[PDB]
Amino acid sequence: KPASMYRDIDKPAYTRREYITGIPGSKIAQHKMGRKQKDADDYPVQISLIVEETVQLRHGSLEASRLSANRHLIKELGEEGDYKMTLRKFPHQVLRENKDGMRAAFGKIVGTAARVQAGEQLFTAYCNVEDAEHVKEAFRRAYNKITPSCRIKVERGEEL
Amino acid sequence: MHALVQLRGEVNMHTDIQDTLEMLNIHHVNHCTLVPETDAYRGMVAKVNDFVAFGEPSQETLETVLATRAEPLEGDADVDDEWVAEHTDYDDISGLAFALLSEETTLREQGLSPTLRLHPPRGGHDGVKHPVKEGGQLGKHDTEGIDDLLEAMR
Amino acid sequence: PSSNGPLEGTRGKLKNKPRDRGTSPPQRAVEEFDDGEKVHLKIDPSVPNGRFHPRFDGQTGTVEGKQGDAYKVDIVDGGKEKTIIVTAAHLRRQE
């Protein structure tokens, strides 16, 4: 279904699983990517993707975007290139749907999303000064699969 | 000592606000009262801040107004030096005006109506939708800013 | 509310902050107030007996005689005057 149905952060925080049940598994394959043995300190360049609007991102999008992003890094930097990107947000907010009309309308659990306040870092990849234009491209594709507009902001790196 | 001038109507105005305005002796738009600067008084003007225009007027200006708009506690009697003299603890309007600003007495303690019912601002005011810092007319003013209003409504 | 008992919604007010936990001191439980004195009502989470209906926490009544050891404190609920039977353990002197 549309993200139009869940992109806003108007409902209350719904995460207490000691009361919620039947929560679908996170489609997010993995948060840690690249060479997860090396450190972010071992890299000169650090580029993050910043969500400009406060929103909710269903795990379907986190995966969808995170995927098409890392999938690119792999393609341009080999399956074991010298980089390491990270998805720092997790889908804690449970989402329901009222799928009887408005009678007993409390919805049934259907998914999970991650609340990101505008200005936060959804992604943060670390690379060497040469792969920067690749890590940037990995992000230009990733921000095309999530509700908000984003900024690709370079952190440590004036080697331009 | 500040001059309060209600610039916005009562309709839709919060009640606890309107009641404060009334406690400050103002019951109509364009009415003005001379309030001292105390913790208690500042607490009230703060609450009324959005529907009024206030500040400390210059002796000169206060005099023009007292002369032009002051009234007894009852009756038409024009307040002038002679009136002031024959009725108040002072010798003339200035003598009074000085006492008000110096906060030694109040329009009431002198058989004067607590309110100076001014005239609409000649040439209009800076608007009742924005404060002074935005070019409006609501809020605190310069001793000069307040005078323009008080005198425009002279 | 889902139910309408006396302790409904008193999770916060009738509970102690961890460090105030445990048996309260005896001094304030024996305090002797005099009629007319203004007092503050606040149930002591650690003291079981001598309580009053939670609704009145925060009230500041006036001691007006006692009943047995407990005190009879007059208060005004909204606009209605009421007399509250409470022991010192749950009282403080105003000022």
Binding site: - | - | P18, R19, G22, T23, Q27, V30
Partner: protein
């Protein structure tokens, strides 16, 4: 200790010298507490009252200032106990104090114990204290008869220092006699 949630006992509870649950029941009577306390070599008797910043001792009596009136025997036994109580009870009387409740602190209500003795003495001093006549040691053991009979099994003096050989519970009588006396500088 551990963290922010940790609950530290009230000081006198840490020290383990005040039983608050019992202290509260005590304070309830409203009467002054007759604090009965012992020591290896001594026995103290205080008449305490409540106060704004703590308790008020209006009258006391320590087994040591007992000799100040003639005592020449040890100061941590029954005759000593009773006597210390009577003394405090007398000063108590002098202070305007009339009734009191027995605070035996962390001690045990063992029948005939020194505290009840302290209590018995104070009561005799004219103080009204809720007691139980038959929880008290019999008049003779108060005199210090059990002790004299122990030195009877002499062979070796029960007393190192010089104070008789078979001991003197009479000294007990002589001292009580001395207090019961109206004069005596309290």
């Amino acid at each position: 200790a551990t963290g922010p949630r940790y609950k530290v006992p009230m000081r006198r509870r840490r020290e383990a010298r005040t039983d608050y649950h019992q202290r509260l029941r005590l304070l309830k009577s409203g009467k002054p507490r007759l604090v009965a306390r012992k020591s290896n070599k001594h026995v103290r008797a205080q008449l305490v009252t409540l106060g704004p910043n703590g308790d008020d001792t209006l009258a006391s009596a320590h087994s040591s200032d007992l000799a100040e009136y003639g005592w020449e025997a040890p100061t941590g036994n029954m005759p000593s106990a009773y006597l210390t109580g009577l003394l405090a009870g007398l000063r108590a009387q002098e202070a305007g104090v009339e009734e009191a409740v027995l605070d035996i602190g962390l001690n045990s209500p063992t029948p005939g114990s020194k505290v009840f003795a302290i209590q018995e003495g104070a009561i005799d001093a004219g103080l009204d204290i809720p007691h139980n006549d038959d929880v008290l040691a019999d008049w003779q053991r108060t005199r210090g008869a059990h002790i004299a009979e122990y030195d009877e099994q002499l062979e070796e003096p029960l007393y190192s220092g010089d104070f008789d050989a078979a001991d003197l519970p009479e000294h007990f009588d002589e001292l009580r006699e001395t207090l019961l006396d109206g004069d005596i500088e309290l």
